[PDB]
Symmetry: D3
């Protein structure tokens, strides 16, 4: 967990995040060509950053956003596929792992159902070792099919990695779920448009802190005809302190080294702010001192989570009373979203 | 949700938070005397802040921290009790609601079990309308008995309020639980010692954002013989933007007006960042466009929460593999905490 | 007054400001083509921002700055004219109001006198409902003819709007004049070049505060051969708090919702910082308590304003004693500016 | 205009501002005693700050706020008087000028009318050379009689000084009036209570910028039984850049040197941001280039100021339509303020 | 190098810095009593911070500043002495090392020569293991005798420590000298008065960065009759990033853990920003590629340092041409300083 | 030392720094063409900035970085040469001095040895008046030959100027050396790639402060195939306060006026923070008061500098014990760098 150098050591994983300029594309050939610009960018960056072990690109960075449904279906990728092969070759040539975005990934029932929004982790041998499909799409505007699972994978030098996408990160539950599965780095790939700039920068830091985990964020830049993307790609320590952060600049890069031993030492030895530990041993000093065992309490005291797990439909109904009953609102109508 | 004025309107609740100087006390009489200084402070503040409807004091602000176990047991309060009556009279005289700290509140099995760490909400008639016992004590150092329940209560002008204490706030689950029960303001009362200053200031904003809720934080100041407390009491909008924030100054005050209609309008009409709504309707545009109903998906996709609710002991065991097996660590031993 | 979402409600006006890349143009045809890129940008933005009711572009965003006098005269627009018609069609198609820049607008005595520097407000039916000519040109460098009047117009959902241009905003008098005419949003369109970046960002916030008014600022970006423009387009609450702010990025966008009811409630019910009210009822508590009526004092106690209104030439003479007597200075001479 | 050193030169005036802890006093004797603590503080500060030429104390720093009307009348000062003599002796002994607060200053019709809220500038010979009575009292809460005039006085080393008080500074008109009378330093003495902290810090900088003038602010600290005061005393350059700023600390001090030659050079030679000059020569390049003289335009184009000067009652009536008709509001009633 | 927790591990040294309130003292007995308040504070802090291995107090924190020469001579300490014994006992009882200030330390020719300004490092057995006398006193105002040597000592867990005092830190040479002697933590103890607040906070970070070293700063707070002290005690990583920082609050505390292995790994493996290494191997890639050996260049290319070492009097003469010839200046005269 | 205006006076030097977009070039013709774009940019900027006396471009701004050794050798410049003549003509036409980058400058033994990395200062007559070759190349990645000398030259209006390059600035020694030779402005030209953004911005301010000197920094922007450059070109006062700073934007410009008389007044009259003076008169008040002369002490008390000057090889050996023995590290190997 240290920032400023271009090197990395046997204890540290050199992570680069890219403020990749959002493409405005329409055909399969254009996608392939942009895939190759990414590949070239990986190989070039490696020459300047000899310590780079992991390079991260934004959500949508391969296809752009395919606003047109037909173009969406026509460019949807197979995984593995030609785009992933282009990326795999760059990771091999540059001896780095990478995180890349396929939007869309063909549904099992393509073209009858919406594609997924997917990330892949590719290792330095070129193999796909995690495939993550976005669990919470950025509705209403965006129409991908929801995924249903998080993953943790052994990454470079053994660092445990989970991937999440953009809007997923707004929900503390997903970062918790990944850290509780043992993630040591959560990578959040986004195509995060203005308005919500200061709140997203803050949310990555607050989630790093709350879950005692390293966080890397790669966010898109530029204007694509519809949205403008605010950059601020960043790498954050497990103590919630920023390592380095880009500004809004197109094809900005940040680079930091995260220590494997530091996060393991901390998760073993921290006490007051060992949040993963504390959550499942509540009140331990109190119970010891009251003669009731030395484990604290583990039981979940939060009715919302008890209800959500037992009766998802009742949790939904409860939220609808606080918010609204239909996915759309007549005060700000959107075509194909009912109100 | 607006800051700068000392007034309040029929739509807005005037909230004051107090950077109360941490007391260093030892006897019941000293506690009573300090209770009366708080009462006087409420009545004085009301003369300068005619819009104040809710005043908030820090965790420990009535007793200080009773580091000595015997003094702890000897000063533990009854609720209702003499301290609460002193506070109630101030709220009546000043025509304000208030939030006050009793640390400890006698256990049902006093003095055989550790006291609770408790907050009360008192209305402007002087009645106790919520009593909250801290669910996650700041172990290892602090030895209160854990509570087990959150609450939502109708507050001034109908604003829905939940109370949480200090270390509770480090855990996104509790803010979620309160907002999902319908809280519109979460009040976090703390005696938050250095070191973790910048991370706690940030966590309140990030939780306001993530849960679309107003947040008020009152934190202690000064040095009490053991800890120094960093202040930065604050009131935050439901959009994650700070309304006003104190510095580290002793007996600093901040004051802001929060709109009842604004938060209700937003929870009804917001779309992209209606996080309470979205969490329980995932992928709605995707499913509509794939011919699968117009509700999105509600089911909980996060294994950690499924496990925690079904098998708390397995969740505990899983965390212990990532962290450590005993509540204490031999690398930083603490008396009465095993390792 | 809330930030983060892409929606708007019946109470809120969705405002988008654009960090539009400064064009470098020379002919009428080039102007028309760039007018059409703006039009396309409006229509695209609306697809991503369903709540947008008002879109704002920078000063000079249609023509760029015409540094060459002949090109200036040759591209000067008629209002209404072909450029305004292009904009009007976009506002209709996207169902939004907009603010656009014509620099220059032909003088009544074109081409014998310098053109105006003008803004138009176009409604969602495509009609021009306010035309504002810049009252204080950015002399010495820029050579437009000065306008002489501010305006207030009913805007989207009834929000009252006034327009001002760049250098105008450096003068607190103009923001006051607009707010005192009843403006609820002042829109400041600028092509604000480096150096003065931090002072202009601050001045918009301080004027929002001082005049209890919403402010939107759209500022240009990029380098145009002469100047570099620093962006930081922003939307600010009437309490002086930023809603959202761009960085320096080309074609950045910010978006925020401003509440109609919130600003009306405040102007009716605020007391200590009701600055519009207070300025014309000075010392009201003092006079009441001294037996002298319950209105305070309204009379203007400031000699400068009394003099400026009665004897503009004497005010000028007075300033020249404090500054200098000629428009130019021999220590930094500029061609055609005498010293 | 330079910060960091404790020295001053023949070109620079050494200014110290004091975050003076707000007193809580009740009798004339207590006032006298606190006057003497201020005097001692001046003399001590001079030993550490050999360059100090001007020392500034907050509004209310001599009496505190006399919330009780009888105590108000009983402690009201004569000017000159015993309190001023105590201050005068310190300025002589320390060879410094100073700015001190008398709240109240007996009305000409004492005790039949409310006292003024007054500042004095005392020179290094001990003579009172400016007496300023607050033009805009902080109504509703505070009940002083309004003054009606600003002043400019020759200060240390010839630096021209004007004094203003707290709430006055919220109104850009007063800073303009002072600068247009030739002020080179405006001193703002305040007892500025929370809430409005960030807006007041910003307003001093924005007024320094807008009026091309040095600004010094001394603000009170601590809690006085009613209000908490937020400090942040500061000295600001004429270019709007902070020289140095205190935090919220009790009896904090800041010290900076302001250059006499720098501000005179600037007011003579600045061009684009010579705001005092520009306001009264609008459109000069435009008129020259349109064949209409080389002076620009001086006439006041702002209807609000024309109306306020000609018909103060009509300006009042106009504001009341935008705000409210009575000084008080029934939604937040205050005793003795009608609604 | 991680912040937020109260623990420490076998790899990390728990450092606490104290914003100690500046005493205003006059006799030996008062000094002894304040020495005992420090001792009590160490022991109390240890109960809240079980990981604390090193506690740091500000310059002057034991005596205050003895402005009166006779009181200076009368309270000057012997080292070892009664004050050091009081501190030693606290370090033993709390099992911590500490850094304490003796101002003055009797000169070898006491009372015929000015005392030193001295820091001691005391280990957890109570032994004094480093004594540092300030090399660059804060002239003109302060009159201590200059020391002439820096030191590096093995500290807790083997972390190498050097001590420096206040004004010393303004000079990059001293931090370099300590790091080049092998220091891994430089501790800067200060009684750093306003004005220069933002520049000193920045200088500690910039020196941490430039010398690849951990830095801890303890600075005094409050007002002592002469000066006000601005706090902002801090602990900084070797990468220049702040771990934690106090505000201006009296008796504020910060606490952070610095890793022994992290700084050793970095000094061994960093490349682009291994500044200690690079300075003495300049141009290594260039020389290798030009066929001239693989060591780069070590020779000192800076004439100032060559001159200062060879001919200190010529270096002095050279500086006097750029600045002034006498220690005092007639434009700001100070008694006993000639001009 | 003042910011905001586009003018300059007989006392002030108008400095512009350029966030020049890093070129990606391969041949001599491409270099010449880009040289001409710089020339055009100088002439255009002058039309908008009539006060500009000095314009500064980043390191590498003429050639880009020539990553390929053959292209490096093929484009290496002669000085004077065709590129310098292109720049000289622009400085004449625009009546400005300028700072330009030649990377590489042919070695005396070209093409047998690596080129230098060089800056030139060109006056407003077009003459080269300083040529500086980088003393500390950014090894390992970059392979220029090291220079060995700093220079001070009379600049516009007599302001004394020294030039330094990028990585040089990480070493406080070089800024000291220049200021001690009499530099009043140090110009740092960089092609400073991410990661180290916040540390470099801070280092320029801290060096301005520590050496009582004006600083101008021009840094590159964009992505060049290998690195991304972070901009933040800036001009800083001698008191360490930023005048103006760019963001990350491509071809951003900042402009500020630095006063000749202000820095001379300060270096003559400052006392507590006259760091150039103090370093060579240590302990002056102490010695005077101890009867030992009125000059303080000049001798160098820092063993590292004594050793480095006397025995560079021993200084090297000493550093290698703290860091490592070879220029390369096997944990992060780089081709042609041994380990
Ligand atoms: Cl999505
Ligand atoms: Cl607790
Ligand atoms: Cl203009
Ligand atoms: Cl008042
Ligand atoms: Cl000293
Ligand atoms: Cl280099």
């Amino acid at each position: 967990m240290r920032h400023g150098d271009i090197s990395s050591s046997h204890d540290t994983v050199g992570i680069a995040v890219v403020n990749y300029k959002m493409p405005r594309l329409h055909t399969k050939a254009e996608v392939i060509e942009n895939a190759k610009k990414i590949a070239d960018m990986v190989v070039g960056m490696k020459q300047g950053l000899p310590g780079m072990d992991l390079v991260v690109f934004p959500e949508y960075s391969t296809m752009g956003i395919m606003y047109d449904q037909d173009e969406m279906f026509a460019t949807a990728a197979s995984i593995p596929g030609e785009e992933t092969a282009i990326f795999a070759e760059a990771c091999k040539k540059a001896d780095t792992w990478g995180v890349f975005s396929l939007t869309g990934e063909k549904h099992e029932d393509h073209p009858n159902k919406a594609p997924y929004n997917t990330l892949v982790l590719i290792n330095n041998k070129g193999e796909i070792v995690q495939k993550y499909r976005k669990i919470i799409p950025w509705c209403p505007i965006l129409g991908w099919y929801p995924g249903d699972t998080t993953y943790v994978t052994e990454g470079p030098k053994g660092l445990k990695i989970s991937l999440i996408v953009c809007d997923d990160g707004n929900y503390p539950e997903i970062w918790r779920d990944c850290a509780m599965k043992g993630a040591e780095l959560i990578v959040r790939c986004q195509g995060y448009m203005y308005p919500a700039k200061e709140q997203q920068i803050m949310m990555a830091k607050a989630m790093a802190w709350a879950n005692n985990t390293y966080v890397a964020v790669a966010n898109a830049t530029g204007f694509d005809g519809v949205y403008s993307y605010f950059g601020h790609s960043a790498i954050i320590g497990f103590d919630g302190r920023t390592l380095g952060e880009c500004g809004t600049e197109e094809n900005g890069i940040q680079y930091a080294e995260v220590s494997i031993s530091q996060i393991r030492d901390f998760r073993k030895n921290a006490q007051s702010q060992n949040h993963l530990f504390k959550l499942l041993h509540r009140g331990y000093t109190g119970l010891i001192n009251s003669g009731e065992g030395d484990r604290g309490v583990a039981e979940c005291p939060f009715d919302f989570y008890r209800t959500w797990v037992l009766d998802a439909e009742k949790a939904r109904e409860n939220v609808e009373k606080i918010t609204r009953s239909t996915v759309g609102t007549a005060e700000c109508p959107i075509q194909g979203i009912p109100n």
